[PDB]
Each structure stands twice: as C-alpha cells, then as structure tokens.
Short mmCIF file of all heavy atoms in Angstrom, two decimals:
data_model
loop_
_atom_site.label_atom_id
_atom_site.label_comp_id
_atom_site.label_asym_id
_atom_site.label_seq_id
_atom_site.Cartn_x
_atom_site.Cartn_y
_atom_site.Cartn_z
N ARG A 19 49.92 38.34 35.50
CA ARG A 19 48.94 38.28 36.59
C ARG A 19 48.88 36.88 37.08
O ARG A 19 49.26 35.99 36.36
CB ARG A 19 47.55 38.70 36.09
CG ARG A 19 47.48 40.13 35.54
CD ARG A 19 46.28 40.33 34.62
NE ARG A 19 46.32 39.41 33.48
CZ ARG A 19 45.50 39.48 32.43
NH1 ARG A 19 44.59 40.45 32.33
NH2 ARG A 19 45.63 38.58 31.46
N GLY A 20 48.41 36.69 38.31
CA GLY A 20 48.18 35.38 38.89
C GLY A 20 47.20 35.49 40.05
O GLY A 20 46.55 36.52 40.20
N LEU A 21 47.15 34.46 40.86
CA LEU A 21 46.19 34.26 41.93
C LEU A 21 47.05 34.04 43.19
O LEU A 21 48.01 33.27 43.14
CB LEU A 21 45.35 32.99 41.63
CG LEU A 21 44.25 32.63 42.64
CD1 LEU A 21 43.19 33.72 42.61
CD2 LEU A 21 43.63 31.25 42.39
N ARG A 22 46.76 34.72 44.31
CA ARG A 22 47.37 34.36 45.60
C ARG A 22 46.31 34.17 46.66
O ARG A 22 45.18 34.64 46.51
CB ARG A 22 48.44 35.39 46.01
CG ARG A 22 48.10 36.38 47.11
CD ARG A 22 49.18 37.44 47.17
NE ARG A 22 48.73 38.76 46.72
CZ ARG A 22 49.51 39.83 46.58
NH1 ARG A 22 50.83 39.77 46.78
NH2 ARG A 22 48.97 40.97 46.19
N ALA A 23 46.67 33.44 47.72
CA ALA A 23 45.75 33.17 48.81
C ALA A 23 45.82 34.25 49.90
O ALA A 23 46.86 34.89 50.08
CB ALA A 23 46.04 31.81 49.41
N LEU A 24 44.69 34.47 50.58
CA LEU A 24 44.62 35.32 51.79
C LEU A 24 44.56 34.46 53.06
O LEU A 24 44.87 34.93 54.14
CB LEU A 24 43.40 36.24 51.71
CG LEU A 24 43.25 37.02 50.39
CD1 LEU A 24 41.86 37.63 50.27
CD2 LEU A 24 44.32 38.09 50.22
N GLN A 25 44.22 33.18 52.90
CA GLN A 25 44.03 32.25 54.01
C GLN A 25 44.72 30.92 53.69
O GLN A 25 44.85 30.57 52.50
CB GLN A 25 42.53 32.06 54.35
CG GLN A 25 41.55 32.02 53.17
CD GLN A 25 40.35 32.96 53.34
OE1 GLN A 25 40.52 34.19 53.53
NE2 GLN A 25 39.14 32.41 53.21
N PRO A 26 45.18 30.20 54.73
CA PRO A 26 45.90 28.97 54.50
C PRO A 26 45.04 27.94 53.74
O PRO A 26 43.82 28.06 53.74
CB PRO A 26 46.21 28.46 55.91
CG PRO A 26 45.28 29.19 56.82
CD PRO A 26 45.10 30.52 56.18
N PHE A 27 45.66 26.97 53.08
CA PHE A 27 44.89 25.84 52.54
C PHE A 27 45.66 24.59 52.88
O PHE A 27 46.90 24.54 52.71
CB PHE A 27 44.67 25.94 51.05
CG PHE A 27 43.64 26.98 50.66
CD1 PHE A 27 44.04 28.22 50.16
CD2 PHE A 27 42.26 26.72 50.79
CE1 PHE A 27 43.12 29.18 49.82
CE2 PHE A 27 41.34 27.70 50.42
CZ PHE A 27 41.77 28.92 49.94
N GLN A 28 44.95 23.60 53.43
CA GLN A 28 45.56 22.34 53.81
C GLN A 28 45.50 21.46 52.61
O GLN A 28 44.67 21.67 51.73
CB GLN A 28 44.80 21.66 54.96
CG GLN A 28 44.61 22.54 56.19
CD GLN A 28 45.85 23.35 56.42
OE1 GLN A 28 45.94 24.50 56.00
NE2 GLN A 28 46.86 22.73 57.05
N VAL A 29 46.39 20.50 52.57
CA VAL A 29 46.34 19.47 51.55
C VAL A 29 44.91 18.93 51.48
O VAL A 29 44.32 18.62 52.51
CB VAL A 29 47.37 18.37 51.85
CG1 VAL A 29 47.15 17.14 50.93
CG2 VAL A 29 48.77 18.95 51.68
N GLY A 30 44.36 18.88 50.26
CA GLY A 30 43.02 18.31 50.04
C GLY A 30 41.88 19.32 49.97
O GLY A 30 40.81 18.99 49.46
N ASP A 31 42.11 20.53 50.48
CA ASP A 31 41.12 21.59 50.46
C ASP A 31 40.73 22.07 49.05
O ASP A 31 41.56 22.27 48.14
CB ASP A 31 41.61 22.83 51.25
CG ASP A 31 41.51 22.68 52.78
OD1 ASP A 31 41.12 21.60 53.30
OD2 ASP A 31 41.83 23.68 53.47
N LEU A 32 39.45 22.32 48.89
CA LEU A 32 38.97 23.00 47.71
C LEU A 32 39.27 24.52 47.78
O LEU A 32 38.87 25.20 48.73
CB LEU A 32 37.48 22.74 47.54
CG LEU A 32 36.79 23.20 46.26
CD1 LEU A 32 37.50 22.71 45.01
CD2 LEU A 32 35.38 22.63 46.37
N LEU A 33 40.02 25.03 46.81
CA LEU A 33 40.26 26.47 46.70
C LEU A 33 39.07 27.17 46.04
O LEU A 33 38.52 28.13 46.57
CB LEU A 33 41.55 26.74 45.93
CG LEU A 33 42.84 26.72 46.74
CD1 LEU A 33 43.36 25.30 46.97
CD2 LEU A 33 43.92 27.59 46.09
N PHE A 34 38.69 26.68 44.86
CA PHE A 34 37.47 27.13 44.15
C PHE A 34 37.14 26.17 43.04
O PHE A 34 37.94 25.29 42.70
CB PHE A 34 37.63 28.52 43.53
CG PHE A 34 38.73 28.61 42.52
CD1 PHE A 34 38.45 28.85 41.21
CD2 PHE A 34 40.05 28.55 42.90
CE1 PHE A 34 39.47 28.96 40.28
CE2 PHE A 34 41.07 28.66 41.99
CZ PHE A 34 40.79 28.84 40.67
N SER A 35 35.96 26.39 42.46
CA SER A 35 35.54 25.62 41.30
C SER A 35 35.08 26.64 40.23
O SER A 35 34.83 27.77 40.53
CB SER A 35 34.41 24.68 41.72
OG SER A 35 33.20 25.43 41.82
N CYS A 36 34.94 26.23 38.99
CA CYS A 36 34.71 27.15 37.89
C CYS A 36 33.91 26.48 36.78
O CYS A 36 34.37 25.48 36.20
CB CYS A 36 36.04 27.63 37.35
SG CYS A 36 35.89 28.89 36.09
N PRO A 37 32.69 26.99 36.52
CA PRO A 37 31.93 26.28 35.51
C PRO A 37 32.56 26.60 34.23
O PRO A 37 33.16 27.66 34.11
CB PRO A 37 30.54 26.90 35.61
CG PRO A 37 30.46 27.40 36.99
CD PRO A 37 31.85 27.91 37.29
N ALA A 38 32.46 25.69 33.27
CA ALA A 38 33.05 25.97 31.96
C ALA A 38 32.31 27.10 31.28
O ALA A 38 31.11 27.11 31.26
CB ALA A 38 32.98 24.78 31.12
N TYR A 39 33.06 28.04 30.70
CA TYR A 39 32.52 29.16 29.98
C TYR A 39 32.07 28.67 28.61
O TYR A 39 31.05 29.06 28.12
CB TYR A 39 33.62 30.26 29.83
CG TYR A 39 33.25 31.36 28.84
CD1 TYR A 39 32.63 32.51 29.25
CD2 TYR A 39 33.50 31.22 27.48
CE1 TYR A 39 32.26 33.48 28.35
CE2 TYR A 39 33.15 32.18 26.56
CZ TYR A 39 32.53 33.31 27.00
OH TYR A 39 32.19 34.33 26.12
N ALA A 40 32.88 27.76 28.05
CA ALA A 40 32.58 27.05 26.80
C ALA A 40 33.32 25.72 26.82
O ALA A 40 34.37 25.60 27.41
CB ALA A 40 32.99 27.84 25.61
N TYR A 41 32.74 24.69 26.25
CA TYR A 41 33.30 23.37 26.31
C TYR A 41 32.78 22.57 25.10
O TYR A 41 31.73 22.92 24.50
CB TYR A 41 32.95 22.65 27.60
CG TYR A 41 31.49 22.46 27.80
CD1 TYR A 41 30.84 21.36 27.28
CD2 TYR A 41 30.73 23.45 28.40
CE1 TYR A 41 29.49 21.19 27.41
CE2 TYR A 41 29.38 23.33 28.53
CZ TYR A 41 28.76 22.16 28.05
OH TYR A 41 27.42 21.97 28.22
N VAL A 42 33.57 21.57 24.71
CA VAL A 42 33.15 20.70 23.64
C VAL A 42 33.58 19.28 23.98
O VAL A 42 34.72 19.04 24.47
CB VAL A 42 33.72 21.19 22.29
CG1 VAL A 42 35.24 21.02 22.21
CG2 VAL A 42 33.10 20.45 21.13
N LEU A 43 32.71 18.31 23.75
CA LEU A 43 33.10 16.92 23.91
C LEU A 43 33.84 16.48 22.65
O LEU A 43 33.41 16.78 21.55
CB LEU A 43 31.88 16.01 24.07
CG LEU A 43 32.13 14.50 24.36
CD1 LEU A 43 32.42 14.20 25.84
CD2 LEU A 43 30.90 13.67 23.99
N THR A 44 34.95 15.77 22.85
CA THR A 44 35.80 15.33 21.72
C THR A 44 35.02 14.34 20.82
O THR A 44 34.22 13.53 21.32
CB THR A 44 37.18 14.81 22.23
OG1 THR A 44 38.16 14.83 21.20
CG2 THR A 44 37.07 13.39 22.83
N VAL A 45 35.25 14.45 19.50
CA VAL A 45 34.53 13.60 18.49
C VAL A 45 34.63 12.07 18.78
O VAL A 45 33.66 11.38 18.68
CB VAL A 45 34.89 13.95 17.00
CG1 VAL A 45 36.40 13.86 16.72
CG2 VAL A 45 34.18 13.03 16.06
N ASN A 46 35.76 11.56 19.20
CA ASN A 46 35.84 10.13 19.55
C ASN A 46 34.99 9.67 20.73
O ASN A 46 34.79 8.47 20.88
CB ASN A 46 37.29 9.70 19.85
CG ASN A 46 38.23 9.97 18.70
OD1 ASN A 46 39.41 10.27 18.92
ND2 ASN A 46 37.73 9.88 17.49
N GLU A 47 34.52 10.58 21.56
CA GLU A 47 33.59 10.17 22.61
C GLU A 47 32.10 10.36 22.31
O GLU A 47 31.24 10.05 23.15
CB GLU A 47 33.97 10.82 23.92
CG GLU A 47 35.36 10.33 24.41
CD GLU A 47 35.35 8.85 24.71
OE1 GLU A 47 34.30 8.23 24.93
OE2 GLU A 47 36.44 8.27 24.73
N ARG A 48 31.78 10.85 21.12
CA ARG A 48 30.39 10.78 20.67
C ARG A 48 29.78 9.37 20.74
O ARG A 48 30.31 8.42 20.18
CB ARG A 48 30.27 11.27 19.23
CG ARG A 48 30.68 12.72 19.15
CD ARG A 48 30.37 13.22 17.78
NE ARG A 48 30.98 14.52 17.51
CZ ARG A 48 31.02 15.02 16.26
NH1 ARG A 48 30.46 14.34 15.21
NH2 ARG A 48 31.62 16.19 16.07
N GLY A 49 28.60 9.30 21.37
CA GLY A 49 27.87 8.04 21.55
C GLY A 49 28.22 7.44 22.90
O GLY A 49 27.52 6.57 23.38
N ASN A 50 29.32 7.90 23.50
CA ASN A 50 29.80 7.38 24.79
C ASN A 50 29.37 8.24 25.99
O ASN A 50 29.00 7.70 27.03
CB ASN A 50 31.34 7.21 24.73
CG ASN A 50 31.76 6.14 23.71
OD1 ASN A 50 30.93 5.40 23.28
ND2 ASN A 50 33.00 6.11 23.30
N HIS A 51 29.44 9.54 25.83
CA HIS A 51 29.24 10.53 26.90
C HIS A 51 28.18 11.55 26.47
O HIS A 51 28.00 11.77 25.28
CB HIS A 51 30.58 11.27 27.24
CG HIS A 51 31.63 10.42 27.90
ND1 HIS A 51 32.41 9.52 27.21
CD2 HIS A 51 32.04 10.34 29.19
CE1 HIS A 51 33.25 8.92 28.04
NE2 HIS A 51 33.06 9.41 29.24
N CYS A 52 27.42 12.09 27.43
CA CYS A 52 26.46 13.17 27.18
C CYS A 52 27.23 14.39 26.68
O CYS A 52 28.10 14.89 27.36
CB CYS A 52 25.70 13.58 28.47
SG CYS A 52 24.32 14.77 28.34
N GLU A 53 26.89 14.90 25.53
CA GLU A 53 27.51 16.15 25.07
C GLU A 53 27.33 17.36 25.96
O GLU A 53 28.16 18.25 25.95
CB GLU A 53 27.09 16.42 23.63
CG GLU A 53 27.65 15.25 22.83
CD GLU A 53 27.87 15.55 21.38
OE1 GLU A 53 28.08 16.72 21.07
OE2 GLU A 53 27.88 14.57 20.60
N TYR A 54 26.29 17.36 26.79
CA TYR A 54 26.03 18.51 27.66
C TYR A 54 26.82 18.41 28.98
O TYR A 54 27.54 19.36 29.40
CB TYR A 54 24.55 18.68 27.95
CG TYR A 54 24.31 19.94 28.76
CD1 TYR A 54 24.65 21.20 28.24
CD2 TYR A 54 23.84 19.87 30.06
CE1 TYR A 54 24.47 22.35 28.99
CE2 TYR A 54 23.65 20.99 30.82
CZ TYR A 54 23.97 22.22 30.30
OH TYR A 54 23.75 23.34 31.07
N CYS A 55 26.72 17.28 29.64
CA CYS A 55 27.30 17.12 30.95
C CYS A 55 28.46 16.17 31.08
O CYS A 55 29.02 16.03 32.16
CB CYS A 55 26.17 16.75 31.94
SG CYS A 55 25.63 15.04 31.78
N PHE A 56 28.86 15.50 30.00
CA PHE A 56 29.99 14.58 29.98
C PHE A 56 29.75 13.25 30.72
O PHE A 56 30.62 12.42 30.81
CB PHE A 56 31.32 15.30 30.39
CG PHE A 56 31.91 16.21 29.30
CD1 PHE A 56 31.11 16.92 28.40
CD2 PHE A 56 33.29 16.39 29.22
CE1 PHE A 56 31.67 17.73 27.40
CE2 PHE A 56 33.83 17.27 28.27
CZ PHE A 56 33.03 17.96 27.38
N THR A 57 28.52 12.99 31.17
CA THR A 57 28.28 11.78 31.90
C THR A 57 28.25 10.64 30.92
O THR A 57 27.61 10.74 29.89
CB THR A 57 26.94 11.83 32.61
OG1 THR A 57 26.96 12.91 33.56
CG2 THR A 57 26.61 10.48 33.29
N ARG A 58 28.96 9.58 31.26
CA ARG A 58 28.95 8.38 30.46
C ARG A 58 27.71 7.50 30.74
O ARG A 58 27.48 7.12 31.87
CB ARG A 58 30.19 7.54 30.73
CG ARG A 58 30.22 6.31 29.86
CD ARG A 58 31.55 6.07 29.16
NE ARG A 58 31.80 4.66 29.28
CZ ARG A 58 32.18 4.08 30.42
NH1 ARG A 58 32.40 4.84 31.50
NH2 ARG A 58 32.36 2.76 30.48
N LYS A 59 27.01 7.13 29.69
CA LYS A 59 25.88 6.24 29.81
C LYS A 59 25.85 5.30 28.63
O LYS A 59 26.19 5.71 27.50
CB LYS A 59 24.58 7.06 29.81
CG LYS A 59 24.43 7.98 31.01
CD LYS A 59 23.29 8.97 30.87
CE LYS A 59 21.91 8.39 30.99
NZ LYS A 59 21.71 8.02 32.41
#
C-alpha cells in the first residue's frame, strides 16, 4: 500500500501533518528538552 495525490503539489507545499501516536524523548536529552513537547529550555 502507499499514498498518491489527487491534486498537484508545488515544491514547498505542505501535503499533511500527523500528530505522534506515541513518542519518547531519547535518554541523552533528558534535562535538555521537555519530555512532552520536545521544546528545549
């Protein structure tokens, strides 16, 4: 199976976005990035 387009897409266009179904922040970035949203602070 795969994905095909019904409408043209120009270079740079967003096709779609996809929230993570499940995700984990890597152990070496603990203390560096928010475990929930990955934002560095």
Side-chain angles (χ1 to χ4, degrees):
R19 299 159 301 189
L21 181 66
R22 105 191 111 185
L24 310 167
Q25 38 230 57
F27 286 102
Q28 306 321 96
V29 169
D31 283 3
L32 188 52
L33 275 81
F34 60 114
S35 77
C36 185
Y39 168 92
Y41 60 87
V42 69
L43 185 81
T44 200
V45 57
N46 303 147
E47 296 296 340
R48 297 188 193 168
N50 295 345
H51 291 78
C52 187
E53 297 204 27
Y54 185 62
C55 76
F56 285 33
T57 298
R58 182 132 137 286
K59 296 169 72 72

